[PDB]
RNA sequence: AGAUACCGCCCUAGUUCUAACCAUAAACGAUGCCAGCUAGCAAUUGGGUGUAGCUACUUUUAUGGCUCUCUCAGUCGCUUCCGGGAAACCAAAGCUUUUUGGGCUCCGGGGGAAGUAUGGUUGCAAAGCUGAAACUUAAAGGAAUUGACGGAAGGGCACCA
RNA sequence: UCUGGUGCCAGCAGCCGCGGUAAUUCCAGCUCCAAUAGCGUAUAUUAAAGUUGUUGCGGUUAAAACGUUCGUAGUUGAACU
């Protein structure tokens, strides 16, 4: 579904195209930026569904007199634990949608889900209680026990089915009638799921393999060589 | 003035680990607070601390790892029986996987996992996870 | 996060800092993984495998990653003579 | 909102401080909330000075200087353009600049 | 009264720094005529605006050339540059004139505990 | 051990003013100062730089592709030692401007993906070091005893103000980076004398003829 | 046009001092007090202690002045947090974790009607400390952004100046 | 974004808002959607309400630190067996 295959302009986009790595989490393990959007729809994209949230107009006062940029909020998500928001203003509503999907496909972050008191059968919701702010709106996330279907407003209802989480209790402080700043306040919580130092992660680790230095003089070539 | 030694040596721990120091100086080490760290020492969170013995009140120079997230005190020391011990683990601790609420039960200073098997109740002394 | 038959099946294991053990997030774009190799005793004959240190962004953004390698290097045998 | 961390100026550990009178306006503005100009001026313009040093009997008679201090209302120092309407990042600069010229305001 | 050649005359003014450094000289009427073969000017009377500049270009070049251009010899005089003064080293060789206390630095730091000297 | 103090090039430390620093001591950097004399000046521990120059030698090597290891000095006093770090190595030199984002942009054709910057003085050009924490790249640096040590590792405390100082251990960092997988047969005295790596002149002061000639005729 | 105003003249109560009353100010840092912690950088107020650092001269010393170096209590200043906040911004206005917890006290609950009416109390008075409702209302407000580009300063332009 | 009617009218609308001879909001026709032997309206009350705050708010500028300090009742009080 290329339909025309595109050149890797960045470094590790070539390694993706070279087949140097088949692990999307290997990018997440060393926290190096996915910079071009053609990276992840090679790794993912098999009917990976997204839906627009919020395309309400945004104006600016000029001399003759008021011109509109339509700002879009799109939300893309893997149902096995990846998430993204799209934030892009444009001229008209078609390129507002399509322009943010690239931004949605670049902000894709893994989701840590887990257990609460019972280590039985496909880790479900959240390992702990997390929250995240952006502009007065905080959203704590509570690990709900099994089969306790989503307890949130419709803006993180459609967002947390896209996150690989079974169920949730949530308690959203703030002005959540701003339907775009509500969505971005959930992500600072879910991005903290791989930032909470549980005692599940107190061993040292195999330290990583350094994908630069491990695949170094196989990039001493000057060619953009694929398979 | 210091209406708690336990607050003025647990925020002093917690303020010095969010900056990531490796040693905290606490003052002035009531034997209430030594057996609070000894609960935290034997669950990994705290290194082997040292009590400098000046004959005024004491000082401790407490080593630590960096596994701590929020190690505060509850005040005032609410008397908690055994049947309402889980209303104070639900709304306080992050998940029932880990974390502790430390109690001063009738036997000693202990956490909420050892007290619910030994079947003791007491006052809430603080919390750490 | 374990299950019945003892399994890390979350998605992966994130790195942790070498001198503070803070977890490096998925979007910590200021995370250094330096690689340092020692020598055969006098000078030369460079081995393979690096005595690798890793440091998150918040230690650099406060700025003591300079010293944070220096006394890692004392115990590990990288650098003596201070 | 609080446009300055100073407010006026120097009102710390005083409570309340003495006022002086403006020159052009004759207000009663604080001593510290005051555009002050310790004006040093030559008496004889230094361009008609050769007319006067002609008439000097003595060793060309080096000329005395005029000395005053110009306590200013703020609304009457903006009006006389001792100070003006800075930018919000240029608002924060106090000591720069001297850095202009030889002796100004004489002329 | 422009007082510099104003609009977009660097279509030719920075292609003659290396691609046409030679093939012209200081004469204005020579490089009036060499411009017609190097680029297809489709309407010509732009030609002398993009020819008359060399009177200002080569004059600015031959004495104290200004930023942003290469002539293949402006620091290919680096081949005639590497002066090796004998013998640029510690000429006093130990050295004696030092910060008047740093001998005791190099007592503890250093075995080389040679002759010293101090000035305040 | 012959990573030792090595007296054969410690006498050059004493002439090129590498044992002095600013009156600003910079609270992140008092393990590097040995003493503060009169005149407010700081005699820095250049012996502590000895382990750090060998650490700077160890830091560049073990990277198997030495093309994406960058040396930078934006301020013009060190813009000659940066250029002749490439006549030894595969390292790309950059002097002058950067066009930010020199790393954090992909539409442009001037972007680079390096792995370890080597900045001569960080307070002069931390504006690409601020770009050097969006793409997970360490910044080794030479530092005076006043330096903003945000994002940098490892700082090296010599002098970083005089032209003889920055000229000296830029060659010495170029020395042991070619003693480390460069194999010059065990530190044989170089064909390149101690300051070909040097700032040519206070341009343009006293400068006689080429090839180091004196004044024979009157 | 008007001018019980601004501007100009002599002036009265007042400003002045005493002995009482009054008890309010944008009485402001629009930021209660004691306590612990958390960072840089530079200045200064006060005290202490090593500088044969200088240095005035009874002879150098005793002192005084400063010099850098410390040290207490700070107060200013500026820079950004692993800070926080809606922002403006603030070493506190942070440590208010993942509804948190050192202690104590006061005050607010959309806007008006209103600090009114009324009662009580204080006062020589002016007035002060207390202090509602009826009815009305879908907004009032805060910090910021773009235009508006006016006794707003700056830098420029034109015979529709 | 159905069809006729009316034309800041008649009226509708909890609030925002509609209506001024093309009305997606009125009045009717043709349809449609919710719950269904049900459902609509009025008053009260609980949740919503992190807008009463023990859990759990706010008080530099949005409503809010007494002008100031003493001070009893009260509330809180260093370590030590």
Coordinates of N, CA, C and O in Angstrom, one line a residue, chain F residues 69-174:
Chain F
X69 N 31.2 11.9 13.8 CA 31.7 12.4 15.1 C 32.2 13.8 14.8 O 33.1 14.0 14.0
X70 N 31.6 14.8 15.5 CA 31.8 16.2 15.0 C 32.6 17.0 15.9 O 32.5 16.9 17.2
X71 N 33.4 17.9 15.4 CA 34.2 18.9 16.1 C 33.8 20.2 15.7 O 33.5 20.5 14.5
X72 N 33.5 21.1 16.6 CA 32.9 22.4 16.4 C 33.7 23.5 17.3 O 33.9 23.2 18.5
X73 N 34.0 24.6 16.7 CA 34.3 25.8 17.4 C 33.8 27.0 16.6 O 34.3 27.3 15.5
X74 N 32.7 27.6 17.1 CA 32.1 28.7 16.4 C 32.8 30.0 16.5 O 32.8 30.8 15.6
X75 N 33.4 30.3 17.7 CA 34.1 31.5 17.8 C 35.5 31.4 17.1 O 36.1 30.4 17.1
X76 N 36.0 32.5 16.5 CA 37.0 32.4 15.5 C 38.4 32.1 16.0 O 39.3 31.8 15.2
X77 N 38.6 32.2 17.4 CA 40.0 31.9 17.9 C 40.4 30.5 17.8 O 41.5 30.1 17.7
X78 N 39.4 29.6 17.7 CA 39.7 28.2 17.6 C 39.3 27.6 16.3 O 39.3 26.3 16.2
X79 N 39.0 28.4 15.3 CA 38.5 27.9 14.0 C 39.6 27.4 13.1 O 39.4 27.3 11.9
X80 N 40.8 27.2 13.6 CA 41.8 26.5 12.8 C 42.1 25.1 13.3 O 42.3 24.2 12.5
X81 N 42.1 24.9 14.6 CA 42.3 23.6 15.2 C 41.1 22.7 14.9 O 41.3 21.4 14.9
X82 N 39.9 23.2 14.6 CA 38.8 22.4 14.2 C 39.0 21.8 12.8 O 38.6 20.7 12.5
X83 N 39.7 22.6 11.9 CA 39.8 22.2 10.5 C 40.8 21.1 10.3 O 40.6 20.2 9.5
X84 N 41.9 21.2 11.1 CA 42.9 20.2 11.0 C 42.8 19.0 12.0 O 43.7 18.3 12.2
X85 N 41.6 18.9 12.6 CA 41.3 17.7 13.2 C 40.8 16.6 12.2 O 40.8 15.4 12.5
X86 N 40.4 17.1 11.0 CA 40.0 16.2 9.9 C 41.1 15.7 9.0 O 40.9 14.7 8.3
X87 N 42.3 16.4 9.0 CA 43.4 15.8 8.3 C 44.0 14.6 8.9 O 44.8 13.9 8.3
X88 N 43.7 14.3 10.2 CA 44.0 13.1 10.9 C 42.9 12.1 10.7 O 43.2 10.9 10.5
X89 N 41.7 12.5 10.9 CA 40.6 11.6 11.2 C 39.6 11.6 10.1 O 39.8 12.2 9.0
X90 N 38.5 10.9 10.3 CA 37.3 10.9 9.5 C 36.3 11.9 10.0 O 35.2 12.0 9.4
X91 N 36.6 12.6 11.0 CA 35.7 13.5 11.7 C 35.3 14.7 10.8 O 36.2 15.4 10.2
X92 N 34.1 15.1 10.8 CA 33.6 16.2 10.0 C 33.8 17.5 10.8 O 33.4 17.6 12.0
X93 N 34.5 18.5 10.3 CA 34.6 19.8 11.0 C 33.6 20.8 10.5 O 33.2 20.8 9.3
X94 N 33.1 21.6 11.4 CA 32.2 22.7 11.1 C 32.7 23.9 11.9 O 32.8 23.8 13.1
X95 N 33.0 25.0 11.2 CA 33.3 26.3 11.8 C 32.4 27.4 11.2 O 32.1 27.3 10.1
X96 N 32.0 28.3 12.1 CA 31.2 29.4 11.7 C 29.7 29.2 12.1 O 29.4 28.7 13.2
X97 N 28.8 29.5 11.2 CA 27.4 29.4 11.5 C 26.9 27.9 11.4 O 27.7 27.0 11.0
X98 N 25.7 27.7 11.7 CA 25.1 26.4 11.8 C 23.9 26.1 11.0 O 23.7 25.0 10.6
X99 N 23.1 27.2 10.6 CA 21.7 27.1 10.3 C 20.9 26.2 11.2 O 20.7 25.0 10.8
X100 N 20.6 26.6 12.4 CA 19.6 25.8 13.2 C 18.3 25.8 12.5 O 17.8 26.8 12.0
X101 N 17.7 24.6 12.4 CA 18.2 23.3 13.0 C 19.2 22.5 12.1 O 18.8 21.9 11.2
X102 N 20.5 22.5 12.5 CA 21.5 21.8 11.8 C 21.4 20.3 12.0 O 22.1 19.5 11.4
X103 N 20.5 19.8 13.0 CA 20.3 18.4 13.1 C 18.8 18.1 13.1 O 18.3 17.1 12.7
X104 N 18.0 19.1 13.7 CA 16.6 18.9 13.9 C 15.7 19.4 12.7 O 14.7 20.1 12.9
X105 N 16.1 19.0 11.5 CA 15.3 19.4 10.3 C 15.6 18.4 9.2 O 16.8 18.0 9.1
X106 N 14.6 18.0 8.5 CA 14.8 16.9 7.5 C 14.4 17.4 6.0 O 14.9 16.7 5.1
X107 N 13.7 18.4 5.8 CA 13.4 18.9 4.5 C 14.7 19.5 3.9 O 15.0 19.4 2.7
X108 N 15.5 20.2 4.8 CA 16.8 20.8 4.4 C 17.8 19.7 4.0 O 17.7 18.6 4.4
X109 N 18.8 20.1 3.1 CA 19.9 19.2 2.8 C 21.1 19.4 3.6 O 22.1 18.7 3.3
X110 N 21.1 20.2 4.6 CA 22.3 20.5 5.4 C 22.3 19.8 6.7 O 23.2 20.1 7.6
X111 N 21.4 18.9 6.9 CA 21.3 18.2 8.2 C 22.3 17.2 8.4 O 22.8 16.6 7.4
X112 N 22.7 16.9 9.6 CA 23.7 15.9 9.9 C 23.2 15.0 11.1 O 22.4 15.5 11.9
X113 N 23.6 13.8 11.1 CA 23.3 12.9 12.2 C 24.6 12.4 12.9 O 25.1 11.3 12.6
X114 N 25.2 13.2 13.7 CA 26.5 12.9 14.4 C 26.2 12.0 15.6 O 25.0 11.7 15.9
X115 N 27.2 11.7 16.3 CA 27.1 10.8 17.5 C 27.8 11.4 18.7 O 27.4 11.1 19.8
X116 N 28.8 12.3 18.6 CA 29.4 12.9 19.8 C 30.1 14.2 19.3 O 31.1 14.2 18.6
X117 N 29.5 15.3 19.8 CA 30.1 16.6 19.4 C 31.3 16.8 20.3 O 31.4 16.3 21.4
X118 N 32.3 17.6 19.7 CA 33.4 18.0 20.5 C 33.5 19.6 20.3 O 33.9 20.1 19.3
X119 N 32.9 20.3 21.3 CA 32.9 21.7 21.3 C 34.1 22.3 22.0 O 34.5 21.8 23.1
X120 N 34.8 23.3 21.4 CA 35.9 23.9 22.1 C 35.5 24.7 23.3 O 36.1 24.5 24.4
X121 N 34.5 25.5 23.2 CA 34.1 26.3 24.4 C 32.6 26.4 24.4 O 32.0 26.9 23.5
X122 N 31.9 25.8 25.4 CA 30.4 25.6 25.3 C 29.6 26.9 25.4 O 28.6 27.0 24.8
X123 N 30.1 27.9 26.2 CA 29.4 29.1 26.4 C 29.3 30.0 25.1 O 28.5 30.8 25.0
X124 N 30.3 29.7 24.2 CA 30.3 30.4 22.9 C 29.2 29.9 22.0 O 28.4 30.6 21.4
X125 N 29.1 28.6 21.9 CA 28.2 27.9 20.9 C 27.4 26.8 21.6 O 27.4 25.6 21.2
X126 N 26.7 27.1 22.7 CA 25.8 26.2 23.2 C 24.5 26.2 22.4 O 23.6 25.3 22.7
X127 N 24.3 27.1 21.5 CA 23.1 27.1 20.7 C 23.0 25.9 19.7 O 21.8 25.6 19.3
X128 N 24.0 25.3 19.3 CA 23.9 23.9 18.8 C 23.9 22.8 19.8 O 23.4 21.7 19.5
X129 N 24.4 23.0 21.0 CA 24.3 22.1 22.1 C 22.9 22.0 22.5 O 22.4 20.9 22.9
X130 N 22.1 23.1 22.5 CA 20.7 23.0 22.7 C 20.0 22.3 21.6 O 19.0 21.6 21.8
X131 N 20.5 22.3 20.4 CA 20.1 21.4 19.3 C 20.6 20.0 19.6 O 20.0 19.0 19.1
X132 N 21.6 19.8 20.4 CA 22.3 18.5 20.6 C 21.6 17.8 21.8 O 22.3 17.0 22.4
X133 N 20.4 18.1 22.1 CA 19.6 17.3 23.1 C 18.2 17.1 22.6 O 17.3 16.9 23.4
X134 N 18.0 17.1 21.3 CA 16.8 16.7 20.6 C 17.1 15.4 19.9 O 16.1 14.7 19.5
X135 N 18.3 15.0 19.7 CA 18.7 13.8 18.9 C 19.6 12.9 19.6 O 20.4 12.2 18.9
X136 N 19.6 12.9 20.9 CA 20.3 11.9 21.8 C 21.8 11.8 21.5 O 22.4 10.7 21.4
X137 N 22.4 13.0 21.4 CA 23.9 13.0 21.1 C 24.6 13.7 22.3 O 24.3 14.7 22.8
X138 N 25.6 13.0 22.8 CA 26.5 13.6 23.8 C 27.3 14.7 23.3 O 27.6 14.8 22.1
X139 N 27.8 15.6 24.2 CA 28.6 16.7 23.9 C 29.8 16.6 24.9 O 29.7 17.0 26.0
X140 N 30.9 16.2 24.4 CA 32.2 16.4 25.1 C 32.6 17.8 24.9 O 32.2 18.4 23.9
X141 N 33.4 18.4 25.8 CA 33.8 19.8 25.6 C 35.0 20.1 26.4 O 35.3 19.4 27.5
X142 N 35.8 21.0 25.9 CA 36.8 21.7 26.8 C 36.1 22.8 27.5 O 35.3 23.5 26.9
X143 N 36.5 23.0 28.8 CA 35.8 24.1 29.5 C 36.9 24.9 30.3 O 37.9 24.3 30.8
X144 N 36.7 26.2 30.4 CA 37.3 27.0 31.4 C 36.6 26.7 32.7 O 35.5 26.1 32.7
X145 N 37.1 27.1 33.8 CA 36.5 26.9 35.1 C 35.2 27.7 35.3 O 34.5 27.6 36.3
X146 N 34.8 28.6 34.3 CA 33.5 29.1 34.2 C 32.9 28.6 32.9 O 33.3 28.9 31.8
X147 N 31.9 27.7 33.0 CA 31.2 27.2 31.9 C 29.8 26.7 32.3 O 29.6 26.2 33.4
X148 N 28.8 27.0 31.4 CA 27.5 26.3 31.6 C 27.5 24.9 31.2 O 27.5 24.5 30.1
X149 N 27.5 24.0 32.2 CA 27.6 22.5 32.0 C 26.3 21.8 31.8 O 26.2 20.6 32.0
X150 N 25.3 22.5 31.3 CA 24.0 21.9 30.9 C 24.3 21.0 29.6 O 24.9 21.5 28.7
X151 N 23.8 19.8 29.7 CA 23.8 18.8 28.7 C 25.2 18.2 28.3 O 25.3 17.3 27.5
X152 N 26.3 18.7 28.9 CA 27.6 18.3 28.3 C 28.3 17.3 29.2 O 28.1 17.2 30.4
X153 N 29.0 16.4 28.6 CA 29.8 15.3 29.2 C 30.8 14.8 28.1 O 30.3 14.4 27.0
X154 N 32.1 14.9 28.3 CA 32.7 15.3 29.6 C 33.4 16.6 29.5 O 34.1 16.8 28.5
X155 N 33.2 17.5 30.4 CA 33.9 18.7 30.4 C 35.4 18.5 30.7 O 35.8 17.6 31.5
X156 N 36.2 19.3 30.1 CA 37.7 19.2 30.3 C 38.2 20.5 30.7 O 38.2 21.5 30.0
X157 N 38.8 20.6 31.9 CA 39.2 21.9 32.6 C 40.6 22.5 32.3 O 41.5 22.4 33.1
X158 N 40.8 23.0 31.1 CA 42.2 23.6 30.9 C 42.3 25.1 31.0 O 42.7 25.6 32.1
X159 N 42.0 25.8 29.9 CA 42.0 27.3 30.0 C 41.0 27.9 29.1 O 40.2 28.8 29.6
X160 N 40.9 27.4 27.9 CA 39.9 27.8 26.9 C 39.8 29.3 26.6 O 38.7 29.7 26.2
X161 N 40.8 30.1 26.9 CA 40.7 31.5 26.6 C 41.8 32.0 25.6 O 41.6 32.7 24.7
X162 N 43.1 31.6 25.9 CA 44.2 32.0 25.1 C 44.3 31.0 23.8 O 43.9 29.9 23.9
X163 N 44.9 31.6 22.8 CA 45.0 30.8 21.5 C 46.1 29.7 21.7 O 45.9 28.7 21.0
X164 N 47.1 29.9 22.5 CA 48.0 28.8 22.8 C 47.4 27.7 23.6 O 47.9 26.5 23.4
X165 N 46.4 28.0 24.4 CA 45.8 26.9 25.2 C 44.9 26.0 24.3 O 45.1 24.8 24.4
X166 N 44.0 26.6 23.6 CA 43.1 25.8 22.7 C 43.9 25.2 21.6 O 43.5 24.1 21.1
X167 N 45.0 25.7 21.2 CA 45.9 25.1 20.2 C 46.6 23.9 20.8 O 47.0 23.0 20.0
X168 N 46.8 23.8 22.1 CA 47.6 22.7 22.6 C 46.9 21.4 22.6 O 47.2 20.5 21.9
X169 N 45.9 21.3 23.5 CA 45.3 20.0 23.7 C 44.3 19.6 22.6 O 43.8 18.5 22.6
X170 N 44.0 20.5 21.7 CA 43.3 20.1 20.4 C 44.2 19.2 19.7 O 43.8 18.2 19.0
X171 N 45.5 19.5 19.7 CA 46.5 18.5 19.1 C 46.7 17.3 20.0 O 46.8 16.2 19.5
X172 N 46.6 17.5 21.3 CA 46.8 16.3 22.2 C 45.5 15.4 22.2 O 45.6 14.2 22.4
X173 N 44.3 16.0 22.0 CA 43.2 15.2 21.8 C 43.3 14.5 20.4 O 42.9 13.3 20.3
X174 N 43.9 15.2 19.4 CA 44.2 14.5 18.2 C 45.4 13.6 18.3 O 45.6 12.7 17.4

